[PDB]
Design a protein around this ligand. Structure first.
Ligand SMILES: *[C@@H]1O[C@H](CO)[C@@H](O)[C@H](O)[C@H]1NC(C)=O
Lengths: 51, 49
């Protein structure tokens, strides 16, 4: 698609986007935050150490 | 016999020219529904339809 900016390429470009969609954007949080939301229960010491 | 003469001349020329041109264009699209290949075809910013 990089070569040309015409309508001939956007068709199959959107088709391939349907085939394989890349990640457009994502919200993020530190990795120590997911430890609080685990089934293992309280992990405050390990969470603070990793923070 | 006495002879005397005097001559004087002056010329002044000033020229000024200014030219300024500006043109811009903007485009905003907001489409919701059917994000398939056809709407990507229609997402062509240059052609209007
Ligand atoms: C895209 O391809 C068409 C067909 O070859 C061509 O006419 C057009 O000029 C191209 N667009 C460019 C080079 O920006």
């Amino acid at each position: 698609l990089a070569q040309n900016r015409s309508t001939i390429t956007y068709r199959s470009w959107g088709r391939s986007l349907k085939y394989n969609p890349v990640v457009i954007d994502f919200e993020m949080q530190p990795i120590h935050e997911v430890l609080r939301h685990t089934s293992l229960g309280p992990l405050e010491a390990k969470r603070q150490n990793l923070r | 016999g006495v002879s005397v003469g005097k001559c004087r001349g002056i010329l002044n020329e000033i020229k000024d020219r200014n030219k300024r041109d500006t043109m811009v264009e903007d485009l905003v699209v907001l489409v919701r529904g059917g994000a398939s290949e056809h709407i990507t075809t229609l997402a062509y910013q240059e052609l209007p339809t």
